[PDB]
Design a protein around this ligand. Structure first.
Ligand SMILES: [Ca+2]
Ligand SMILES: [Ca+2]
Ligand SMILES: [Ca+2]
Ligand SMILES: [Zn+2]
Lengths: 534, 60
Protein backbone atom coordinates (compact mmCIF):
# COMPACT_ATOMS: atom_id res chain seq x y z
CA UNK A 1 0.00 0.00 0.00
CA UNK A 2 1.21 3.44 -1.01
CA UNK A 3 -0.03 6.85 0.00
CA UNK A 4 -2.76 8.14 -2.45
CA UNK A 5 -2.75 11.83 -1.42
CA UNK A 6 0.03 14.39 -2.14
CA UNK A 7 1.41 15.71 1.13
CA UNK A 8 3.22 18.99 1.53
CA UNK A 9 5.68 19.86 4.22
CA UNK A 10 3.97 21.38 7.26
CA UNK A 11 6.00 23.14 9.94
CA UNK A 12 3.66 21.92 12.69
CA UNK A 13 5.16 18.42 12.26
CA UNK A 14 8.28 18.53 14.42
CA UNK A 15 10.86 15.71 14.62
CA UNK A 16 14.54 14.87 14.59
CA UNK A 17 15.65 16.07 11.18
CA UNK A 18 18.74 13.84 11.22
CA UNK A 19 16.85 10.72 12.15
CA UNK A 20 16.67 7.66 14.30
CA UNK A 21 18.40 4.46 15.31
CA UNK A 22 16.91 0.91 15.01
CA UNK A 23 15.66 -0.35 18.34
CA UNK A 24 15.33 3.11 19.83
CA UNK A 25 12.50 5.55 20.35
CA UNK A 26 11.16 7.60 17.42
CA UNK A 27 8.62 10.35 18.04
CA UNK A 28 7.21 13.41 16.37
CA UNK A 29 5.37 16.28 17.96
CA UNK A 30 2.47 17.49 15.80
CA UNK A 31 1.28 20.92 16.85
CA UNK A 32 -2.08 20.43 15.15
CA UNK A 33 -5.21 18.41 15.75
CA UNK A 34 -4.77 14.99 14.11
CA UNK A 35 -5.23 11.27 14.60
CA UNK A 36 -3.97 8.87 11.93
CA UNK A 37 -0.40 9.12 10.69
CA UNK A 38 1.76 7.11 8.32
CA UNK A 39 5.46 6.46 8.04
CA UNK A 40 6.26 6.45 4.31
CA UNK A 41 9.27 5.56 2.24
CA UNK A 42 10.32 8.03 -0.44
CA UNK A 43 8.49 6.09 -3.23
CA UNK A 44 5.30 6.36 -1.18
CA UNK A 45 5.22 2.89 0.36
CA UNK A 46 3.45 2.96 3.70
CA UNK A 47 5.46 1.02 6.31
CA UNK A 48 3.46 1.96 9.41
CA UNK A 49 0.02 3.37 10.35
CA UNK A 50 -0.48 4.74 13.75
CA UNK A 51 -2.63 7.06 15.91
CA UNK A 52 -1.18 10.17 17.47
CA UNK A 53 -2.02 10.84 21.11
CA UNK A 54 -2.80 14.19 22.71
CA UNK A 55 -0.57 15.65 25.34
CA UNK A 56 -0.51 19.07 27.02
CA UNK A 57 2.87 20.70 26.55
CA UNK A 58 2.99 22.62 29.83
CA UNK A 59 6.09 24.40 28.56
CA UNK A 60 4.39 26.11 25.56
CA UNK A 61 0.91 25.99 27.11
CA UNK A 62 -0.76 24.12 24.28
CA UNK A 63 -1.92 20.62 23.37
CA UNK A 64 0.29 18.76 20.93
CA UNK A 65 -0.15 15.31 19.37
CA UNK A 66 2.57 12.69 19.72
CA UNK A 67 3.22 10.30 16.85
CA UNK A 68 5.17 7.30 18.21
CA UNK A 69 6.71 5.30 15.37
CA UNK A 70 9.39 3.59 17.45
CA UNK A 71 8.48 0.21 15.96
CA UNK A 72 9.72 1.19 12.51
CA UNK A 73 13.14 -0.46 12.46
CA UNK A 74 14.06 -1.02 8.81
CA UNK A 75 16.94 1.21 7.74
CA UNK A 76 16.00 3.71 5.05
CA UNK A 77 14.75 7.17 4.34
CA UNK A 78 11.23 8.09 5.33
CA UNK A 79 8.78 10.88 6.08
CA UNK A 80 5.77 11.14 8.34
CA UNK A 81 2.48 11.83 6.56
CA UNK A 82 -0.35 13.21 8.70
CA UNK A 83 -3.82 13.46 7.11
CA UNK A 84 -5.27 16.97 7.65
CA UNK A 85 -1.87 18.46 8.34
CA UNK A 86 0.86 17.59 5.89
CA UNK A 87 4.21 15.80 6.04
CA UNK A 88 7.43 16.04 7.96
CA UNK A 89 10.84 16.56 6.39
CA UNK A 90 12.56 13.36 5.26
CA UNK A 91 14.66 11.58 7.88
CA UNK A 92 16.88 8.54 8.04
CA UNK A 93 16.69 5.38 10.13
CA UNK A 94 20.17 3.92 10.42
CA UNK A 95 22.55 2.55 13.03
CA UNK A 96 25.07 5.20 11.89
CA UNK A 97 22.61 8.03 11.52
CA UNK A 98 24.53 10.43 13.83
CA UNK A 99 28.08 9.88 12.49
CA UNK A 100 27.98 12.77 10.03
CA UNK A 101 26.62 15.11 12.71
CA UNK A 102 29.39 13.96 15.08
CA UNK A 103 32.05 14.65 12.51
CA UNK A 104 30.48 18.02 11.76
CA UNK A 105 30.48 19.04 15.44
CA UNK A 106 34.15 18.02 15.54
CA UNK A 107 34.75 20.08 12.38
CA UNK A 108 33.34 23.03 14.31
CA UNK A 109 36.06 22.50 16.95
CA UNK A 110 38.78 22.33 14.28
CA UNK A 111 37.46 25.52 12.73
CA UNK A 112 37.66 27.27 16.14
CA UNK A 113 41.42 26.67 16.37
CA UNK A 114 43.56 29.68 17.23
CA UNK A 115 47.20 30.31 16.22
CA UNK A 116 46.98 28.58 12.87
CA UNK A 117 45.26 28.87 9.55
CA UNK A 118 42.23 26.64 9.17
CA UNK A 119 40.51 25.34 6.05
CA UNK A 120 37.66 22.97 5.33
CA UNK A 121 35.12 22.38 2.59
CA UNK A 122 31.66 21.61 4.01
CA UNK A 123 28.66 21.01 1.72
CA UNK A 124 30.76 22.44 -1.08
CA UNK A 125 31.47 25.64 0.85
CA UNK A 126 35.13 26.56 1.59
CA UNK A 127 35.53 27.97 5.09
CA UNK A 128 38.98 29.32 5.93
CA UNK A 129 41.04 31.87 7.73
CA UNK A 130 44.74 32.69 8.02
CA UNK A 131 46.97 32.32 11.09
CA UNK A 132 45.61 34.32 14.03
CA UNK A 133 46.77 35.53 17.42
CA UNK A 134 50.31 34.44 16.76
CA UNK A 135 51.66 36.86 19.39
CA UNK A 136 49.86 35.35 22.36
CA UNK A 137 50.54 36.54 25.04
CA UNK A 138 52.02 39.31 27.12
CA UNK A 139 52.72 39.12 30.87
CA UNK A 140 52.21 42.77 31.86
CA UNK A 141 49.12 42.15 33.99
CA UNK A 142 50.85 39.23 35.77
CA UNK A 143 54.31 40.52 36.57
CA UNK A 144 54.54 44.06 35.17
CA UNK A 145 56.84 43.07 32.33
CA UNK A 146 56.04 43.49 28.59
CA UNK A 147 57.35 40.00 28.00
CA UNK A 148 55.74 37.54 25.62
CA UNK A 149 55.30 33.97 26.83
CA UNK A 150 53.95 31.62 24.17
CA UNK A 151 50.22 31.09 24.74
CA UNK A 152 49.23 30.25 21.20
CA UNK A 153 46.99 27.38 20.04
CA UNK A 154 43.79 26.24 21.72
CA UNK A 155 40.27 27.03 20.62
CA UNK A 156 38.60 30.37 20.28
CA UNK A 157 35.98 30.15 23.01
CA UNK A 158 32.77 31.34 21.46
CA UNK A 159 31.72 34.04 19.06
CA UNK A 160 34.80 35.92 20.28
CA UNK A 161 38.40 34.88 19.96
CA UNK A 162 39.59 34.97 23.57
CA UNK A 163 40.57 31.78 25.45
CA UNK A 164 39.27 31.03 28.92
CA UNK A 165 40.53 28.28 31.25
CA UNK A 166 37.36 27.78 33.31
CA UNK A 167 35.19 27.22 30.22
CA UNK A 168 37.84 24.93 28.86
CA UNK A 169 37.35 22.84 32.01
CA UNK A 170 33.85 21.54 31.30
CA UNK A 171 34.66 21.42 27.57
CA UNK A 172 37.80 19.32 27.81
CA UNK A 173 36.43 17.29 30.70
CA UNK A 174 33.28 16.38 28.84
CA UNK A 175 35.21 15.49 25.68
CA UNK A 176 37.78 13.40 27.59
CA UNK A 177 34.88 11.58 29.24
CA UNK A 178 33.41 10.92 25.81
CA UNK A 179 36.76 9.33 24.98
CA UNK A 180 36.88 7.24 28.12
CA UNK A 181 33.20 6.26 28.05
CA UNK A 182 33.12 5.45 24.37
CA UNK A 183 36.79 4.65 23.58
CA UNK A 184 36.26 1.64 21.38
CA UNK A 185 33.70 3.60 19.37
CA UNK A 186 35.80 6.75 18.95
CA UNK A 187 39.30 5.39 18.55
CA UNK A 188 38.83 4.36 14.89
CA UNK A 189 37.20 7.62 13.85
CA UNK A 190 38.95 9.68 11.13
CA UNK A 191 38.40 13.44 11.08
CA UNK A 192 39.06 16.25 8.62
CA UNK A 193 42.11 17.63 10.51
CA UNK A 194 45.80 18.25 9.72
CA UNK A 195 46.77 15.39 12.08
CA UNK A 196 44.83 12.77 10.11
CA UNK A 197 48.03 10.85 9.16
CA UNK A 198 49.82 10.74 12.46
CA UNK A 199 49.85 7.93 15.02
CA UNK A 200 47.28 9.53 17.33
CA UNK A 201 43.49 8.96 17.16
CA UNK A 202 42.02 12.04 15.46
CA UNK A 203 39.57 12.72 18.34
CA UNK A 204 42.58 13.08 20.61
CA UNK A 205 44.49 15.25 18.15
CA UNK A 206 41.72 17.84 18.42
CA UNK A 207 41.92 17.73 22.21
CA UNK A 208 45.68 18.00 22.14
CA UNK A 209 45.39 21.31 20.32
CA UNK A 210 43.52 22.61 23.40
CA UNK A 211 45.77 20.97 25.98
CA UNK A 212 48.78 22.51 24.18
CA UNK A 213 47.30 25.90 25.08
CA UNK A 214 46.21 24.94 28.61
CA UNK A 215 49.77 23.91 29.42
CA UNK A 216 50.98 27.48 28.76
CA UNK A 217 48.73 28.99 31.44
CA UNK A 218 50.82 28.27 34.57
CA UNK A 219 52.57 31.35 35.96
CA UNK A 220 56.20 31.80 34.94
CA UNK A 221 57.25 32.12 38.58
CA UNK A 222 56.74 28.40 39.03
CA UNK A 223 54.14 28.83 41.73
CA UNK A 224 51.57 26.66 40.01
CA UNK A 225 48.95 29.40 39.79
CA UNK A 226 47.05 29.31 36.50
CA UNK A 227 46.12 32.47 34.60
CA UNK A 228 42.36 32.78 34.15
CA UNK A 229 42.27 33.61 30.42
CA UNK A 230 44.19 35.02 27.45
CA UNK A 231 42.35 38.11 26.21
CA UNK A 232 42.38 41.44 24.52
CA UNK A 233 41.51 44.24 26.91
CA UNK A 234 38.08 44.70 25.27
CA UNK A 235 36.07 42.81 22.69
CA UNK A 236 37.08 43.38 19.19
CA UNK A 237 34.67 43.84 16.36
CA UNK A 238 33.18 41.53 13.75
CA UNK A 239 36.48 40.92 11.96
CA UNK A 240 38.36 37.80 10.91
CA UNK A 241 40.77 36.64 13.61
CA UNK A 242 43.90 37.11 11.51
CA UNK A 243 42.91 40.80 11.24
CA UNK A 244 42.83 41.30 15.03
CA UNK A 245 46.19 42.79 15.92
CA UNK A 246 45.46 44.17 19.40
CA UNK A 247 47.76 42.77 22.06
CA UNK A 248 46.57 39.81 24.08
CA UNK A 249 47.41 39.29 27.74
CA UNK A 250 47.52 36.63 30.39
CA UNK A 251 44.92 37.55 33.01
CA UNK A 252 45.50 37.07 36.76
CA UNK A 253 44.93 33.65 38.26
CA UNK A 254 41.91 32.09 39.86
CA UNK A 255 41.76 29.08 42.10
CA UNK A 256 39.08 27.53 39.90
CA UNK A 257 41.23 27.92 36.78
CA UNK A 258 44.07 26.30 38.74
CA UNK A 259 41.91 23.34 39.81
CA UNK A 260 40.46 22.97 36.31
CA UNK A 261 44.01 22.92 34.97
CA UNK A 262 44.92 20.07 37.32
CA UNK A 263 41.87 18.06 36.27
CA UNK A 264 42.45 18.61 32.57
CA UNK A 265 46.16 17.85 32.63
CA UNK A 266 45.76 14.82 34.89
CA UNK A 267 43.21 13.43 32.40
CA UNK A 268 45.43 14.29 29.47
CA UNK A 269 48.34 12.45 31.11
CA UNK A 270 46.54 9.10 31.27
CA UNK A 271 44.75 9.57 27.93
CA UNK A 272 47.71 10.56 25.78
CA UNK A 273 50.28 8.16 27.31
CA UNK A 274 49.67 5.34 24.78
CA UNK A 275 50.33 7.73 21.93
CA UNK A 276 52.67 10.51 23.09
CA UNK A 277 54.24 9.41 26.29
CA UNK A 278 56.62 12.34 26.59
CA UNK A 279 53.65 14.70 26.39
CA UNK A 280 51.82 12.61 29.00
CA UNK A 281 54.70 12.99 31.43
CA UNK A 282 54.76 16.75 30.81
CA UNK A 283 51.03 16.85 31.60
CA UNK A 284 51.23 14.95 34.89
CA UNK A 285 54.25 16.89 36.09
CA UNK A 286 52.38 20.14 35.43
CA UNK A 287 49.27 18.84 37.20
CA UNK A 288 51.37 18.00 40.26
CA UNK A 289 52.84 21.50 40.45
CA UNK A 290 49.40 23.14 40.42
CA UNK A 291 47.93 20.51 42.77
CA UNK A 292 50.69 21.27 45.28
CA UNK A 293 49.83 24.98 45.10
CA UNK A 294 46.17 24.12 45.71
CA UNK A 295 47.09 21.95 48.69
CA UNK A 296 49.12 24.77 50.25
CA UNK A 297 46.53 27.48 49.38
CA UNK A 298 43.06 26.11 50.08
CA UNK A 299 41.06 29.37 49.72
CA UNK A 300 38.70 30.30 46.94
CA UNK A 301 40.26 33.07 44.84
CA UNK A 302 38.55 34.98 42.03
CA UNK A 303 40.58 36.28 39.10
CA UNK A 304 41.53 39.95 39.26
CA UNK A 305 40.13 40.62 35.84
CA UNK A 306 38.32 43.90 36.01
CA UNK A 307 40.97 45.51 33.80
CA UNK A 308 39.35 43.44 30.97
CA UNK A 309 35.81 43.58 29.61
CA UNK A 310 35.65 40.15 27.93
CA UNK A 311 34.13 36.94 29.25
CA UNK A 312 34.48 36.50 33.02
CA UNK A 313 33.66 32.83 33.57
CA UNK A 314 33.86 33.69 37.26
CA UNK A 315 32.61 30.49 38.80
CA UNK A 316 31.28 31.28 42.24
CA UNK A 317 33.10 28.49 44.02
CA UNK A 318 36.12 26.29 43.45
CA UNK A 319 34.93 23.48 45.71
CA UNK A 320 33.55 21.51 42.81
CA UNK A 321 36.62 22.28 40.70
CA UNK A 322 38.90 21.02 43.52
CA UNK A 323 36.77 17.86 43.88
CA UNK A 324 37.16 17.21 40.16
CA UNK A 325 40.93 17.82 40.33
CA UNK A 326 41.27 15.30 43.18
CA UNK A 327 39.21 12.70 41.32
CA UNK A 328 41.34 12.99 38.20
CA UNK A 329 44.66 12.94 40.07
CA UNK A 330 43.44 9.83 41.82
CA UNK A 331 42.27 8.12 38.65
CA UNK A 332 45.55 8.88 36.87
CA UNK A 333 47.97 8.17 39.75
CA UNK A 334 46.08 6.18 42.37
CA UNK A 335 47.73 7.69 45.46
CA UNK A 336 45.80 7.48 48.71
CA UNK A 337 46.25 11.24 49.24
CA UNK A 338 44.17 12.01 46.16
CA UNK A 339 41.50 9.46 47.04
CA UNK A 340 41.26 10.90 50.54
CA UNK A 341 40.90 14.45 49.18
CA UNK A 342 38.20 13.39 46.79
CA UNK A 343 36.23 11.26 49.25
CA UNK A 344 36.35 13.89 52.00
CA UNK A 345 35.06 16.51 49.53
CA UNK A 346 32.42 14.31 47.96
CA UNK A 347 30.93 13.13 51.19
CA UNK A 348 29.99 16.68 51.98
CA UNK A 349 27.84 17.23 48.84
CA UNK A 350 24.29 16.96 49.96
CA UNK A 351 23.22 16.06 46.43
CA UNK A 352 25.94 13.99 44.82
CA UNK A 353 24.76 14.39 41.21
CA UNK A 354 23.13 17.51 39.72
CA UNK A 355 20.84 17.37 36.71
CA UNK A 356 21.59 20.92 35.56
CA UNK A 357 25.35 21.46 35.21
CA UNK A 358 27.88 23.37 33.14
CA UNK A 359 31.15 25.26 33.61
CA UNK A 360 30.17 26.72 36.99
CA UNK A 361 29.41 23.38 38.61
CA UNK A 362 31.76 20.62 37.47
CA UNK A 363 31.52 18.17 40.41
CA UNK A 364 29.61 15.68 38.31
CA UNK A 365 32.75 15.10 36.22
CA UNK A 366 34.64 13.96 39.31
CA UNK A 367 31.73 11.85 40.50
CA UNK A 368 31.64 10.13 37.13
CA UNK A 369 35.38 9.44 37.10
CA UNK A 370 35.28 8.10 40.65
CA UNK A 371 32.25 5.91 40.11
CA UNK A 372 33.49 4.32 36.91
CA UNK A 373 37.09 3.76 38.05
CA UNK A 374 38.31 0.19 38.14
CA UNK A 375 40.69 1.03 40.98
CA UNK A 376 40.26 -0.69 44.37
CA UNK A 377 39.99 1.05 47.67
CA UNK A 378 36.90 3.23 47.22
CA UNK A 379 34.69 3.60 50.31
CA UNK A 380 31.72 1.34 49.71
CA UNK A 381 29.17 3.61 51.33
CA UNK A 382 30.28 6.69 49.35
CA UNK A 383 30.13 4.71 46.13
CA UNK A 384 26.59 3.70 46.97
CA UNK A 385 25.47 7.21 47.82
CA UNK A 386 26.86 8.56 44.56
CA UNK A 387 25.32 5.68 42.66
CA UNK A 388 21.90 6.28 44.22
CA UNK A 389 22.06 9.97 43.39
CA UNK A 390 23.11 9.21 39.82
CA UNK A 391 20.28 6.78 39.24
CA UNK A 392 17.70 9.01 40.98
CA UNK A 393 18.76 11.96 38.88
CA UNK A 394 18.76 9.93 35.65
CA UNK A 395 15.26 8.62 36.52
CA UNK A 396 14.11 12.25 37.04
CA UNK A 397 15.49 13.23 33.62
CA UNK A 398 13.65 10.33 32.03
CA UNK A 399 10.41 11.50 33.65
CA UNK A 400 11.00 15.09 32.61
CA UNK A 401 11.55 14.09 28.96
CA UNK A 402 8.57 11.74 28.92
CA UNK A 403 6.32 14.45 30.29
CA UNK A 404 7.52 17.24 27.99
CA UNK A 405 5.69 17.66 24.71
CA UNK A 406 8.95 17.77 22.75
CA UNK A 407 10.98 15.34 24.84
CA UNK A 408 13.11 18.11 26.33
CA UNK A 409 15.28 16.59 29.11
CA UNK A 410 15.69 20.01 30.77
CA UNK A 411 11.91 20.49 31.04
CA UNK A 412 10.78 24.06 31.45
CA UNK A 413 14.17 25.46 32.50
CA UNK A 414 15.57 28.15 30.16
CA UNK A 415 18.63 30.31 30.61
CA UNK A 416 21.65 31.55 28.64
CA UNK A 417 23.36 28.47 27.26
CA UNK A 418 20.62 26.01 28.12
CA UNK A 419 20.79 24.18 24.79
CA UNK A 420 24.23 22.99 25.83
CA UNK A 421 22.83 21.62 29.07
CA UNK A 422 20.04 19.74 27.25
CA UNK A 423 22.68 17.61 25.51
CA UNK A 424 25.12 17.66 28.45
CA UNK A 425 22.49 15.73 30.40
CA UNK A 426 23.33 12.76 28.20
CA UNK A 427 26.40 12.31 30.40
CA UNK A 428 24.22 11.55 33.41
CA UNK A 429 22.05 9.21 31.34
CA UNK A 430 24.97 7.38 29.76
CA UNK A 431 26.84 6.94 33.04
CA UNK A 432 23.60 5.70 34.64
CA UNK A 433 23.24 3.20 31.81
CA UNK A 434 26.76 1.90 32.42
CA UNK A 435 25.99 1.37 36.13
CA UNK A 436 22.45 0.06 35.68
CA UNK A 437 21.62 -0.79 32.10
CA UNK A 438 18.23 0.62 31.18
CA UNK A 439 16.94 1.40 27.74
CA UNK A 440 14.94 4.30 29.15
CA UNK A 441 18.20 6.13 29.88
CA UNK A 442 19.50 5.66 26.35
CA UNK A 443 16.16 6.68 24.82
CA UNK A 444 16.12 9.82 27.03
CA UNK A 445 19.59 10.66 25.72
CA UNK A 446 18.17 10.34 22.22
CA UNK A 447 15.31 12.66 23.28
CA UNK A 448 17.87 15.33 24.20
CA UNK A 449 19.53 14.90 20.81
CA UNK A 450 16.22 14.93 18.99
CA UNK A 451 15.22 18.11 20.74
CA UNK A 452 18.22 20.06 19.37
CA UNK A 453 17.73 18.61 15.86
CA UNK A 454 14.13 19.68 15.31
CA UNK A 455 11.74 18.05 17.79
CA UNK A 456 11.13 21.46 19.34
CA UNK A 457 8.67 24.36 19.14
CA UNK A 458 10.62 26.10 16.43
CA UNK A 459 10.88 23.07 14.14
CA UNK A 460 14.55 23.91 13.66
CA UNK A 461 17.93 22.37 14.16
CA UNK A 462 19.95 24.36 16.70
CA UNK A 463 23.25 23.33 15.05
CA UNK A 464 24.71 25.35 12.19
CA UNK A 465 24.98 23.48 8.94
CA UNK A 466 22.90 20.46 10.04
CA UNK A 467 19.31 19.36 9.82
CA UNK A 468 16.17 21.35 9.15
CA UNK A 469 16.42 25.15 8.84
CA UNK A 470 19.58 25.49 10.99
CA UNK A 471 20.68 28.76 12.55
CA UNK A 472 21.88 31.19 9.93
CA UNK A 473 22.91 34.24 11.99
CA UNK A 474 24.92 33.17 15.06
CA UNK A 475 26.66 35.79 17.13
CA UNK A 476 29.97 34.65 15.67
CA UNK A 477 32.71 36.90 14.33
CA UNK A 478 33.96 34.57 11.55
CA UNK A 479 30.44 34.13 10.28
CA UNK A 480 29.78 37.84 10.32
CA UNK A 481 33.09 38.90 8.81
CA UNK A 482 33.65 36.44 5.96
CA UNK A 483 32.27 36.37 2.42
CA UNK A 484 29.95 33.41 2.86
CA UNK A 485 26.14 33.43 3.25
CA UNK A 486 25.93 30.31 5.43
CA UNK A 487 27.58 30.62 8.86
CA UNK A 488 30.51 28.48 9.91
CA UNK A 489 29.30 24.89 10.39
CA UNK A 490 28.85 22.52 13.29
CA UNK A 491 27.91 24.84 16.18
CA UNK A 492 25.15 24.38 18.74
CA UNK A 493 23.74 27.81 19.51
CA UNK A 494 23.12 28.72 23.13
CA UNK A 495 19.35 28.84 23.03
CA UNK A 496 16.40 30.97 23.85
CA UNK A 497 15.37 32.18 27.27
CA UNK A 498 13.57 33.11 29.47
CA UNK A 499 10.80 31.29 27.61
CA UNK A 500 10.48 28.36 25.25
CA UNK A 501 9.79 30.65 22.26
CA UNK A 502 12.47 33.30 22.93
CA UNK A 503 15.31 32.11 20.62
CA UNK A 504 16.06 34.70 17.93
CA UNK A 505 18.33 33.71 15.02
CA UNK A 506 19.85 37.17 14.57
CA UNK A 507 23.54 38.10 14.83
CA UNK A 508 22.92 40.73 17.51
CA UNK A 509 21.46 38.14 19.91
CA UNK A 510 24.49 37.06 21.90
CA UNK A 511 22.02 36.19 24.60
CA UNK A 512 20.29 33.43 22.61
CA UNK A 513 22.35 32.84 19.47
CA UNK A 514 26.04 32.74 20.35
CA UNK A 515 28.22 29.61 19.92
CA UNK A 516 30.56 28.15 22.51
CA UNK A 517 33.09 25.39 23.04
CA UNK A 518 31.20 24.14 26.08
CA UNK A 519 27.98 23.78 24.08
CA UNK A 520 29.75 21.96 21.29
CA UNK A 521 31.49 19.69 23.78
CA UNK A 522 28.15 18.66 25.22
CA UNK A 523 26.83 17.93 21.76
CA UNK A 524 29.99 15.96 20.96
CA UNK A 525 29.55 13.82 24.07
CA UNK A 526 25.90 13.24 23.26
CA UNK A 527 26.62 12.14 19.68
CA UNK A 528 29.82 10.20 20.55
CA UNK A 529 27.81 7.49 22.28
CA UNK A 530 26.07 6.80 18.98
CA UNK A 531 29.21 6.58 16.81
CA UNK A 532 30.17 3.04 15.73
CA UNK A 533 27.13 2.01 17.75
CA UNK A 534 25.44 -1.38 18.27
CA UNK B 1 8.79 49.46 43.61
CA UNK B 2 9.09 49.29 39.74
CA UNK B 3 11.33 46.79 37.93
CA UNK B 4 12.21 48.06 34.46
CA UNK B 5 13.13 45.35 31.94
CA UNK B 6 13.20 44.85 28.20
CA UNK B 7 11.00 42.15 26.57
CA UNK B 8 10.21 41.41 22.87
CA UNK B 9 12.01 44.73 22.08
CA UNK B 10 9.79 46.92 24.35
CA UNK B 11 10.76 48.70 27.62
CA UNK B 12 8.33 47.22 30.22
CA UNK B 13 7.81 47.76 33.91
CA UNK B 14 6.32 45.62 36.68
CA UNK B 15 5.89 46.43 40.27
CA UNK B 16 7.62 43.78 42.56
CA UNK B 17 4.26 43.35 44.48
CA UNK B 18 3.00 41.55 41.26
CA UNK B 19 6.31 39.42 41.04
CA UNK B 20 5.75 35.73 41.86
CA UNK B 21 9.01 33.75 41.44
CA UNK B 22 12.54 35.12 41.51
CA UNK B 23 15.80 33.23 40.91
CA UNK B 24 19.31 33.66 39.60
CA UNK B 25 21.52 32.44 36.79
CA UNK B 26 25.28 32.86 36.49
CA UNK B 27 26.30 33.74 32.91
CA UNK B 28 29.78 34.11 31.45
CA UNK B 29 29.51 37.83 32.38
CA UNK B 30 27.73 37.93 35.75
CA UNK B 31 24.45 37.31 37.45
CA UNK B 32 20.98 37.52 35.87
CA UNK B 33 17.90 37.79 38.06
CA UNK B 34 14.95 36.03 36.41
CA UNK B 35 11.40 36.46 37.54
CA UNK B 36 7.80 35.75 36.73
CA UNK B 37 4.84 37.96 37.43
CA UNK B 38 1.08 38.11 36.86
CA UNK B 39 4.83 37.15 32.32
CA UNK B 40 8.53 36.52 32.35
CA UNK B 41 11.40 38.92 32.67
CA UNK B 42 14.94 39.35 33.74
CA UNK B 43 17.44 42.00 34.74
CA UNK B 44 21.15 42.02 35.26
CA UNK B 45 21.93 41.94 39.02
CA UNK B 46 23.58 45.31 38.82
CA UNK B 47 20.27 46.80 37.31
CA UNK B 48 18.04 45.21 39.98
CA UNK B 49 16.41 47.37 42.68
CA UNK B 50 17.48 46.20 46.11
CA UNK B 51 13.79 45.17 46.67
CA UNK B 52 14.08 42.63 43.91
CA UNK B 53 17.41 41.50 45.36
CA UNK B 54 15.73 41.19 48.77
CA UNK B 55 13.07 39.01 47.26
CA UNK B 56 15.78 36.87 45.61
CA UNK B 57 17.57 36.45 48.96
CA UNK B 58 14.29 35.32 50.72
CA UNK B 59 13.46 32.91 47.89
CA UNK B 60 16.95 31.56 48.32
CA1 LIG C 1 45.61 11.47 13.96
CA1 LIG D 1 32.80 25.93 40.34
CA1 LIG E 1 29.08 34.89 6.63
ZN1 LIG F 1 43.05 33.13 17.13
Amino acid sequence: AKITENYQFDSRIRLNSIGFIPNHSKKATIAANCSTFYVVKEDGTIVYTGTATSMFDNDTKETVYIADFSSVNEEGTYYLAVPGVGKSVNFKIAMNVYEDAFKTAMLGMYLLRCGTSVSATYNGIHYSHGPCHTNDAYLDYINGQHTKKDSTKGWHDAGDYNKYVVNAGITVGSMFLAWEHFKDQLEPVALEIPEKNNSIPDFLDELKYEIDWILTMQYPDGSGRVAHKVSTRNFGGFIMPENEHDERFFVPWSSAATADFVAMTAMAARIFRPYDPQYAEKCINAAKVSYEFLKNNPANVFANQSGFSTGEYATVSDADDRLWAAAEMWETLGDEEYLRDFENRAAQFSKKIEADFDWDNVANLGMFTYLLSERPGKNPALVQSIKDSLLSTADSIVRTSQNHGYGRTLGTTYYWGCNGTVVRQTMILQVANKISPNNDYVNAALDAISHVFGRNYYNRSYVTGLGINPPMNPHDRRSGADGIWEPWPGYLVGGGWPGPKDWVDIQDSYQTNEIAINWNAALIYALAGFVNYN
Amino acid sequence: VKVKFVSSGEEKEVDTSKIKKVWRNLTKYGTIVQFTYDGRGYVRELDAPKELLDMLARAE
